[PDB]
RNA sequence: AAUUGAAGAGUUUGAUCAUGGCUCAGAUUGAACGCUGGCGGCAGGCCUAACACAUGCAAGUCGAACGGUAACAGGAAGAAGCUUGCUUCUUUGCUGACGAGUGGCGGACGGGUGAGUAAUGUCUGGGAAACUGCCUGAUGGAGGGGGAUAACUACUGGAAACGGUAGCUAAUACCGCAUAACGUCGCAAGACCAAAGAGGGGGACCUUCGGGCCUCUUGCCAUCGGAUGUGCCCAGAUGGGAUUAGCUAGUAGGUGGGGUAACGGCUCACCUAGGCGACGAUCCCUAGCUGGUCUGAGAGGAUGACCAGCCACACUGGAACUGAGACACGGUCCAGACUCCUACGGGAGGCAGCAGUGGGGAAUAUUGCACAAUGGGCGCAAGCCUGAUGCAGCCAUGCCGCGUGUAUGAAGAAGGCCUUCGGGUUGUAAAGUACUUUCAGCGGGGAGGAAGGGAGUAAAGUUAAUACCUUUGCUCAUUGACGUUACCCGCAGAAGAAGCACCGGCUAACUCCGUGCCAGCAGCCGCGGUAAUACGGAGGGUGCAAGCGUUAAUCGGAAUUACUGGGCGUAAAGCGCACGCAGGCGGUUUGUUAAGUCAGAUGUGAAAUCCCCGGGCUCAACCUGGGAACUGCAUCUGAUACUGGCAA
RNA sequence: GCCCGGAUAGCUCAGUCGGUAGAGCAGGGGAUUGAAAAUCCCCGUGUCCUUGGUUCGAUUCCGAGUCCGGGCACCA
C-alpha cells in the first residue's frame, strides 16, 4: 500500500530470505543425526551430535529458534544414544 | 476535483450558435486548437465536445480574458435547449454556411436570441473553404446583414468574419488565420457586461449534475450577488420552496471559493438528491421571492411569417412561459371583451399557472407554444 | 412553562382560592367567584373519587406554579427520603425559593415573585438566583440585589404581607430588606386546609 | 510495563482526572490495574482538591512501575513534604 | 443512613354469580410519522445492504546508529561589481539541519462493525504441563577479526508499475574467533552457547597530527526474578424444536516417533473396541457474550444502543512470512467477483478508521478547527506524527432548566356564542395606566481549563574539576482549538418567543348548529335511520407544554404459564385399566460419617451504573468522594436437630 | 435531458383512417314500510386530459405541454 511503511515489506522479506536459509540448514543436521539412528552406529551418532550442538546453541540466543526447542532436540536424541549405546 | 482556478482574466460567456450540418461543433474544437497555441490549457477535441444535441460548455482564452464558449444545437427541434443555452450569453457568433446562404431556421435562430436579448454577435460566415469566389461571399454576406437589419440589429455594423471550421480544425494556418482574428473582433465588439454583484443575490437553475461520490452539484451563471462557501442560500422551484447551504463551487472542474454575476459556476450544495431539483426553478437569497398561482403581465404578439402565430386563439389557452429558465405552463382568463388575440396585440392577460414558482413584479419574459415563439413581454402584476 | 393566562379561571373552577390575584387588595369580591368555573358551571359535578383526586393535584400543583412533569419528579424524590411520604411532598414544594420569597412578602403574588427571582433581583448568601425551584437549604440568609431593591414594585408589596400570617420557619428584617430562614416547615405551620393525603394515592396509579 | 496515568473523565468543557494504574498498550479510558485517587483541577478554593495515596504508589514503583510527567508532578504537586 | 413496599374498569345474558379470552388506564425506546416551533445546558444520533464507493485525511519516527547532503540556512576559501570588504558569488559535508537509502523501534495499540459463532466463545470459580518486547530489582561480562550490500556512478528493460547487469563503501546490519557461569542436555563425568558501540566535557600525559586516555550519561549480552499481558485444561451456568433418536472411525484410549512456548490425536504408525445419548446426544433454525438498561412490590420477564471488559471479522475464500507478540484494517503470496489505467505485453485497488456519496430504507447529521489538556509511538531532549482525544456545526431524538412578562383595571365595552331574548358567557381577559427585564440583539471588561517546556542562575552530588551531567528553588518572555467564550456591567423597548390531543362510558371536560345508516368517527362497548354532548364547523372547556398526539415495539395489568402465586364431577383438563424399570418420595431405634444444610473467617465477586450520606456547576439534568450493595461461587475451621451414605 | 404506452361519463373498454360519442357493470330518483329487500314505475349523469393549427367540419390529422408508468442516458 502506499504508506512510508511498505519498508516493512522489502525489508522483511530480505529478513525471510535470511531467516529461511538459516532454519533449512539448521534442520539438514538433524537428518545426519537420524540418519545415524537408523545406522546404528552409536559411536558415529554420538559424533553425530558433536558437529550439531554448537550450531542449535548459536540459534538460540539470536532468538531464531525459540531457546526451548532448542534444548528439545537435545533432549530426546541424547535419549536416543544411550537407547543404542 | 482540485486545481484552485484563478480570478484574473475577466470571463466573458460566448457560444457559437448556427444550424445543423454547419460546423458549430467544428469550429468550437478549432478555436481551442487556435488558443493551444498560444496556451497550452485548450485545444478540446471533437470527440470531447460531442450533432451537439446538448449545450455543451467548454472554454478558451486569449492573453488578455477568458471566455466561456457554448456549443449549442443548431436544430429547430432542440429550441428550449437553445433557450437556455442562450440564458448565458454576453455575446454570441453566429454559424451561417457560405453553401447554402443563411437558412429561414438559421433566421430563426437570431429572432429567439432577441427576445431574450442577446447583445452582441460574431457572424463567422462558414464553409469558406467551399468557394473562393468573394462576390458570392458577399452575397450571402450581405443577406445575413439584411437579417439582422431587418431583426432590430445593426446589420450594417455586423462583424462578418469568413472562413472555413473544417481545415481550421486540422490546423491549416490560413484557415487558422480567420480564427485568430476571429478573437479580435470578439474582445472589441463586446465589452465587459453588467454584473449586478451588490444585488440581492439570484442564480437561474439551468442542468443539474450529481457527481459520484461529492453529491449535487447545480450549475449557471450568477445574474447578480454573492454567496460565499458556508451561506445558506435557498431555493424556489415549482414545488415547494426549499433551502440549503453551500459547501463548495469548481468551475470547469477547477476549484472557486466566491460565487459572483457573471461567472458560469457549478455551486455544490448540502446533500439534496436528483428527484427534488430539475431545470427551471431558482437558487437564491434567503426569502427574495415567493411563488404565485396567479398573475397577469404585458405581452406582444407578433407575426407567423416572421416566426410568430397568425390565427387568433381564445380563452383558456395554454401556452408556456419562460422567464430566464422557465417551463411553466398556464390556463389564461383573456381579459373581457378580447375573446380572440389576433397576431399583433399588445394585451395583458390574467394567467393562472399549473406549477407554482417564483412571480415578481417587472419580470422580463417570454411565451412559447406547440414548436414556435408567438411574443414576449415583461410581468408587470402579480396577482 | 408558565400558565400565561386568565389567573382567576383556574381558582374559578376549584371553588377555592389560590392567591393568584392577592395583590395590594385583599379580597377580590368581584369575579362571580365559586358558582362559575365556566359557561355551564352552575351544574354542580357528578363528582367521581377519581376525579377529586385530580382535583386536589391540580389545585395544589398551580398553587406552586409547578407543572406536571416537574412536579411527578417532587414526587419521586419524595418517595426516595425518609419519615412521612406525604409530607416529603410537602416540604419539598415549600422548598421552591420563590415559595420562601412569597412568606417574606417580597412579592405581593407568586408570579411576581418567579419574575423577582428571574430578574437577578435575589442574592442569597450572596449569591444571585434567577431559577425559581433552587432547593432552599436550611440556615441560611436570602437577600436582594441593591440595582433591584426599592424599584416601586417592592414599596407597595411590603405593606401588604401586614395582614399576612408570616409563619414561623422563617422571619423577614423589613429594616435592611432582608430574609432569613429559619428551621424546615412543618406541617401544622402551613395553611392546613388542603387534602395532600388522596395525591400520594393518586401517584400510587 | 504498566504506568500511573490519568483516566479523564468529567462532561464537555467540565473534566475531573482519575488518576489510575494501567496498562500502557491499553486505553486512556479504559482497562487498567487500579485506580487510586484523582485530580480535580476544576475544584474551587475549598476543603478537597486533589487527592492520592503515596503507599499504592510505591508499592507499584518498587516493581517497576514508571509515572507519567504530569502524574509525577501531582506527585510534588500534593507536595509531600508539605 | 443504605430496596418504607403490590389499585382497577369495560365487554358474553332478559338479569345473576363463576370460568374465561379480548381491550384500555402506566412507564420506557439508539425511534419513526403528522402538526407546531424561543433559547440554553448535558447526552445520543445507519438498528436495513457485512451493499457498492470519488477525493482528501486516519502511523510515523531517531543524526545521542551509519555512509552520505540532492536541497535550505551559515562558516570558510575564493571571486567580481565597485559604496576597497557595501555586494555578487563558483567550489566545500567542516557545522545547523536534512529529502532518498541502510538500520532500530512502532505498525498486533488506539479505531470501527456484529456477518459468522449454541460452544473452539462468554460469564463464575478453580488449576498447571508454559511464554513474556518496552519497564524494573539482583549478579557478571562488555576481548579480538573478517566478508557482502542499499543509496550512489555507468548502461539499460518497460507506457507505467516495477526492475536488470558490472563495479563503489560504512555501521548498534549479517557472519566468525575467544571466554564462559547458580544457563542448556545428561545420573554424573563432561560437552556446548553471547554481545554493539555512540554522545557531552576536559587536566596531566599523549598526539602516524583520525585519536588514545579519564570521567559522566546511555545503549548492548546472558541468567534467576518481579510487575503486566497472553496461551492452555477442567467444573457449573449460558436459547427454541423430539413432527431432530441414534451419533462418531483420527473418532474413545494406550505405547512409540515427530511437532508445539507449553499439554494433548495437535499429527502420524501399530494395537484395543470402545466413547457420546433422555439431568436431551447429533441434526435444523435463530443469535455475539457479560457488566448493565427498561418494566416489575419482589420473583421473574424483556433486552444487550451508548460507556466498559471479552471474542470474531477486515471485498469472498485460503495459506504463510517477519517478529517478543499477528497466523495481522491503512503488510505480503494465490484463485474469484466487482471497479480502474493502458502505449493491450501487463499492472493498480478495498471507507465494517473521520467525514462524504449512489442506493437500500419509515428513518439517524459536517468532505470543520487544533494538537492547548489527557493518552499513545520514536527520541536524551526539543520536537514530530496523533479523524485517539479535546471542541465546534446540523437534528426537539432524550432528560433537565428557563422564557414568551408583572401589578392594576368594570361602561363589568366591541365582537363571537348561548338563551326562559331577563340575561348569561368569553372575562381581569383586552384597551388604558404605573413598572421590571432573564433569555434573545448590540457594545465593553473578564475567568478557568496551564501541569509544564526553553534560556539564565545559585546550591547540593558526581568527578582530578569551579566543566559536562543530575536534582531542588528562583527570574524572564510565555504555550488556549473552543472563543465575537463562563461570568459580570450597560443600553433600547413589552419589545423577538404557544401551541397540541381531547370533551357518551371506560377517563379529568359541554351546548348550539349543519349533514340524515349518507358522509365520516373509532382502543373496546359502539355512535349516525331528519331533535348526534361520540360525524363536521363555532364557541366554551379539559389535559400537557416547546412540545402535544398517532404508530411500532417490551414489560406491567396477566394470579390469562400461578417458584413466590392457579387448576381437572359438569366451565379448557384424569391416560380405558394394570404391571413395572430409570427417576422422585419414604415408618422407627442406635452408632457413625459430615455430603446437602447452618454459622463464622478468607479469597473473589473489576470499574462505571443502581442504593445511602455528602460535595461541585445560580438549581437540576449531569459530574463526583466515601460507604454500602453486588442477594452468587470456591476453600478452610467448627456444629449435629432434619435429609442422604454405610452397619446392626 | 431523450423516446414510447395509457389519459374516452363512477369503473373497464368499443367506436378512427374527418360528418353532431355507445354498451356493460353501476348507481340513483319515486309508490309500499318503523326502515330496507323483494315488487313496480323511470332512467345517461360525458370539458373524449387540456390547449392550438390544416377547417363548411377533428375522439379519429399534425403537434406542444401536464400527469403516471416503463426503458436509455449525462457526470462541476
Ligand atoms: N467544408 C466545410 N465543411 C464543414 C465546415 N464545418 C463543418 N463542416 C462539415 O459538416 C459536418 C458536421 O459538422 P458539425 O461541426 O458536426 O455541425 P453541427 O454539430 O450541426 O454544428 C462535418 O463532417 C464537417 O465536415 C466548414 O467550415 N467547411
Ligand atoms: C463545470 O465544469 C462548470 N463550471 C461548467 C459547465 C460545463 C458543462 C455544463 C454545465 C456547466
Known amino acids: 500500500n502506499i504508506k512510508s511503511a511498505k519498508k516493512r515489506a522489502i525489508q522483511s522479506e530480505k529478513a525471510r530470505k535470511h531467516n529461511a536459509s538459516r532454519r533449512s540448514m539448521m534442520r539438514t543436521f538433524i537428518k545426519k543425526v537420524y540418519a545415524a539412528i537408523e545406522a546404528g552406529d552409536k559411536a558415529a551418532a554420538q559424533k553425530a551430535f558433536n558437529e550439531m550442538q554448537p550450531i542449535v546453541d548459536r540459534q538460540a540466543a539470536k532468538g531464531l529458534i525459540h531457546k526451548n526447542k532448542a534444548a528439545r532436540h537435545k533432549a530426546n536424541l541424547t535419549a536416543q544414544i544411550n537407547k543404542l549405546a | ?383 | 412553562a408558565r400558565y400565561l393566562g386568565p389567573k382567576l379561571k383556574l381558582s374559578r373552577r376549584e371553588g377555592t382560592d389560590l392567591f393568584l390575584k392577592s395583590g395590594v387588595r385583599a379580597i377580590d369580591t368581584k369575579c362571580k367567584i365559586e358558582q362559575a368555573p365556566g359557561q355551564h358551571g352552575a351544574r354542580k359535578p357528578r363528582l367521581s373519587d377519581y376525579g377529586v383526586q385530580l382535583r386536589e393535584k391540580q389545585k395544589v400543583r398551580r398553587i406552586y406554579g409547578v407543572l406536571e412533569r416537574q412536579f411527578r419528579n417532587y414526587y419521586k424524590e419524595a418517595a426516595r427520603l425518609k419519615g412521612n411520604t406525604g409530607e416529603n411532598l410537602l416540604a419539598l414544594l415549600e422548598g421552591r425559593l420563590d415559595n420562601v420569597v412569597y412568606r417574606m412578602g417580597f412579592g405581593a403574588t407568586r408570579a411576581e415573585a418567579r419574575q423577582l427571582v428571574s430578574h437577578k433581583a435575589i442574592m442569597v448568601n450572596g449569591r444571585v438566583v434567577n431559577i425559581a425551584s433552587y432547593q432552599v437549604s436550611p440556615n441560611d440568609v436570602v437577600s436582594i440585589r441593591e440595582k433591584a431593591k426599592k424599584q416601586s414594585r417592592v414599596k407597595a408589596a411590603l405593606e401588604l404581607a401586614e395582614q399576612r400570617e408570616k409563619p414561623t420557619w422563617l422571619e423577614v428584617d423589613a429594616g435592611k430588606m432582608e430574609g432569613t430562614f429559619k428551621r424546615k416547615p412543618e406541617r401544622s405551620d402551613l395553611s392546613a386546609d388542603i387534602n395532600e393525603h388522596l395525591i400520594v394515592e393518586l401517584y400510587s396509579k | ?82
Not at chain 2, 2 to 31: M, Q, S
Open chain 4, 1 to 82: 510495563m504498566v504506568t500511573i496515568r490519568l483516566a479523564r473523565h468529567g462532561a464537555k468543557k467540565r473534566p475531573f482526572y482519575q488518576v489510575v494504574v494501567a496498562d500502557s498498550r491499553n486505553a486512556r479510558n479504559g482497562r487498567f490495574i487500579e485506580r487510586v485517587g484523582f485530580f480535580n483541577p476544576i475544584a474551587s478554593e475549598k476543603e478537597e482538591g486533589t487527592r492520592l495515596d503515596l503507599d499504592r504508589i510505591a508499592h507499584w514503583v518498587g516493581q517497576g512501575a514508571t509515572i507519567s510527567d504530569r502524574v509525577a508532578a501531582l506527585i510534588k504537586e500534593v507536595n509531600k513534604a508539605a
Open chain 2, 1 to 383: 476535483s482540485k486545481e484552485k482556478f484563478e480570478r484574473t482574466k475577466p470571463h466573458v460567456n460566448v457560444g457559437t450558435i448556427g444550424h445543423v450540418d454547419h460546423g458549430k461543433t467544428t469550429l468550437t474544437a478549432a478555436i481551442t486548437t487556435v488558443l493551444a497555441k498560444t496556451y497550452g490549457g485548450a485545444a478540446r477535441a471533437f470527440d470531447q465536445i460531442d450533432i451537439t444535441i446538448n449545450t455543451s460548455h467548454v472554454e478558451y482564452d486569449t492573453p488578455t480574458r477568458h471566455y466561456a464558449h457554448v456549443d449549442c444545437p443548431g436544430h429547430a427541434d432542440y429550441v428550449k435547449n437553445m433557450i437556455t443555452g442562450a440564458a448565458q450569453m454576453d455575446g454570441a457568433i453566429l454559424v451561417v454556411a457560405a453553401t447554402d446562404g443563411p437558412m429561414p431556421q438559421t433566421r430563426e435562430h437570431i429572432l429567439l436570441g432577441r427576445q431574450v436579448g442577446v447583445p452582441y454577435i460574431i457572424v463567422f460566415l462558414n464553409k469558406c473553404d467551399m468557394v473562393d469566389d468573394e462576390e458570392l461571399l458577399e452575397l450571402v454576406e450581405m443577406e445575413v446583414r439584411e437579417l439582422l437589419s431587418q431583426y432590430d440589429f445593426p446589420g450594417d455594423d455586423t462583424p462578418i468574419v469568413r472562413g472555413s471550421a473544417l481545415k481550421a480544425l486540422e490546423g491549416d494556418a490560413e484557415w487558422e488565420a480567420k480564427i485568430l482574428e476571429l478573437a479580435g473582433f470578439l474582445d472589441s465588439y463586446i465589452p465587459e457586461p453588467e454584473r449586478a454583484i451588490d444585488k440581492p443575490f439570484l442564480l437561474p437553475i439551468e442542468d443539474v449534475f450529481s457527481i459520484s461520490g461529492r453529491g449535487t452539484v447545480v450549475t449557471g451563471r450568477v445574474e447578480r450577488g454573492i454567496i460565499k462557501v458556508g451561506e445558506e442560500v435557498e431555493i424556489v422551484g415549482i414545488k415547494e420552496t426549499q433551502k440549503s447551504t453551500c459547501t463548495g463551487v469548481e468551475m470547469f472542474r477547477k476549484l472557486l471559493d466566491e460565487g459572483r454575476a457573471g461567472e458560469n459556476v457549478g455551486v455544490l450544495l448540502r446533500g439534496i438528491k436528483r428527484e427534488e431539483i430539475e431545470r427551471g426553478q431558482v437558487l437564491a437569497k434567503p426569502g427574495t421571492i415567493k411563488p404565485h398561482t396567479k398573475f397577469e403581465s404585458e405581452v406582444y404578439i407578433l407575426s407567423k411569417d416572421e416566426g410568430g402565430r397568425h390565427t387568433p386563439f381564445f380563452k383558456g389557452y395554454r401556452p408556456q412561459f419562460y422567464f430566464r429558465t422557465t417551463d411553466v405552463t398556464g390556463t389564461i382568463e383573456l381579459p373581457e371583451g378580447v375573446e380572440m388575440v389576433m397576431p399583433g396585440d399588445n394585451i395583458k392577460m390574467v394567467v393562472t399557472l399549473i406549477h407554482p414558482i417564483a412571480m415578481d413584479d417587472g419580470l422580463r419574459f417570454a411565451i412559447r407554444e406547440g414548436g414556435r415563439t408567438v411574443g414576449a413581454g415583461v410581468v408587470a402584476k402579480v396577482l
